[PDB]
C-alpha cells in the first residue's frame, strides 16, 4: 500500500458518502467512489468483489471501511487494461464514411442494442463536451475528452 | 479557538464602529462616554414605554459597572464570526438553483439543509419554519430571508 | 360506427429524430345525410 495519504482519501470519501448513517457503505456507493478516484474497471466486478450475485436488497448490502482498503488494492491490481487503437478501430468499423457525418442515431443504436444498459439520460446528457453537432467527431476528439479522468 | 478578542474587533468592516458610536452617542444623553440607568431607562423609553423588567441591569451585570465605548463595541465584536455580508449569500442561493427565481421547494430546502454537510437535527432546523416566512405551496424565498437575516428588513416593529 | 370520409394525416419528425408538428386533409365529407334517410340510420353524432 501507499503512505496514508490515499487512506486519508478513502476516509474523506467516506465522510464525504455519509448518507443515511456515515458508518455503513452500499455497494453502489464504494463502486461509484472507487471508479471515480481513477480506477476504470467496474462492469463485471461485482461477482469478483462480493463472491455473491446477490443483488435484491439496496438498503442493506453490508459493506465497512475496514476490509474496503485491500478490496481497493485487489481491484487496482489493474486486471485490464485497453488503449485507444481497438476503440478507433472498432468505431471506425462502426463508421460509415470514414469521417463522420452524422454520428447521432447510430451511437445511440449501438448503445440500445447493448443488453446490459443502465441510462438513458446519460445519452442524452453525452452531448456536452465538445459532441455538440450531429456527430460531427470523427471520434478522436471524444475518446482524447474521455481518456482524460 | 481562544475567542477572547484581544483586538478591539479587528477582524471587521470599521464603518459599523461608526454607527455604533453614533448608536453609543445618541443613547448617553449624559454623553460622558459611559452608559447609565438615567441614559437607558429615557432614552429606551424614546421608543419604548418605561419598561418594568430591570433587563438594563441586565447590560450593567452582562459587564459589570458602568461599560466604556471600546467595552461596548467588543461586547459586540465577540457576537460577530462566522459570518458575512449578503452578497455572498445571495451569489450561493443563486449558484444551487439556476433558475435564481428563490423556489427554494420545502422537501427540497430540507434535503439541502438538513441531511448532508454537518449533521444536525430537523428538529431545530424547525426553528427557520416557524419562525421565518416561508413562502406558499413549499417554494422558500430568499431575497426576503437574506434581508432579515442582515439589518435590510426585520420581521416586525415595536 | 363508420369512418364516412377519406383522410390523411402526415407526422413531421426532423433530422435530430424527434417530432415536430402534424398536418392532416380531409377528402369529401358525405352529404345528402340530413336529407331523407335510409331505412334504421341516422345523420350524425352530433345532434344526438
Ligand atoms: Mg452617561
Ligand atoms: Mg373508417
Given at each position: ?149 | ?111 439541502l439543509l438538513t441531511t448532508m454537510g454537518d449533521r444536525f437535527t430537523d428538529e431545530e432546523v424547525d426553528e427557520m419554519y416557524r419562525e421565518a416566512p416561508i413562502d406558499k405551496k413549499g417554494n422558500f424565498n430568499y431575497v426576503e430571508f437574506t434581508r432579515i ?10 | ?48
Open positions: 500500500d501507499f503512505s496514508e495519504e490515499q487512506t486519508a482519501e478513502f476516509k474523506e470519501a467516506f465522510q464525504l458518502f455519509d448518507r443515511t448513517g456515515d458508518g455503513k457503505i452500499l455497494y453502489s456507493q464504494c463502486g461509484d467512489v472507487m471508479r471515480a478516484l481513477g480506477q476504470n474497471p467496474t462492469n463485471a466486478e461485482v461477482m469478483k468483489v462480493l463472491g455473491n450475485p446477490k443483488s435484491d436488497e439496496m438498503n442493506l448490502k453490508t459493506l465497512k471501511f475496514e476490509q474496503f482498503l485491500p478490496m481497493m488494492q485487489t481491484i487496482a491490481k489493474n486486471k485490464d487494461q485497453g488503449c485507444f487503437e481497438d476503440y478507433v478501430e472498432g468505431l471506425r468499423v462502426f463508421d460509415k464514411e470514414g469521417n463522420g457525418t452524422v454520428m447521432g442515431a447510430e451511437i445511440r443504436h449501438v448503445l440500445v442494442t447493448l443488453g446490459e444498459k443502465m441510462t438513458e439520460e446519460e445519452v442524452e446528457q453525452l452531448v456536452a463536451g465538445h459532441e455538440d453537432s450531429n456527430g460531427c467527431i470523427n471520434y478522436e476528439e471524444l475518446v482524447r475528452m474521455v481518456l482524460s479522468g | 479557538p481562544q475567542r477572547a478578542t484581544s483586538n478591539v474587533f479587528a477582524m471587521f468592516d470599521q464603518s459599523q464602529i461608526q454607527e455604533f458610536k453614533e448608536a453609543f452617542n445618541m443613547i448617553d444623553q449624559n454623553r460622558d462616554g459611559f452608559i447609565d440607568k438615567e441614559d437607558l431607562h429615557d432614552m429606551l423609553a424614546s421608543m419604548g414605554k418605561n419598561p418594568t423588567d430591570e433587563y438594563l441591569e441586565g447590560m450593567m451585570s452582562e459587564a459589570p459597572g458602568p461599560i466604556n465605548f471600546t467595552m461596548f463595541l467588543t461586547m459586540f465584536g465577540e457576537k460577530l464570526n462566522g459570518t458575512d455580508p449578503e452578497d455572498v449569500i445571495r451569489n450561493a442561493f443563486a449558484c444551487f438553483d439556476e433558475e435564481a427565481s428563490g423556489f427554494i421547494h420545502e422537501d427540497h430546502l430540507r434535503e437575516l442582515k439589518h435590510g428588513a426585520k420581521d416586525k416593529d415595536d | 360506427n363508420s369512418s364516412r370520409f377519406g383522410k390523411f394525416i402526415r407526422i413531421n419528425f426532423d433530422v435530430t429524430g424527434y417530432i415536430v408538428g402534424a398536418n392532416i386533409e380531409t377528402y369529401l365529407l358525405e352529404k345528402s345525410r340530413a336529407i331523407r334517410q335510409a331505412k334504421d340510420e341516422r345523420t350524425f353524432h352530433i345532434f344526438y
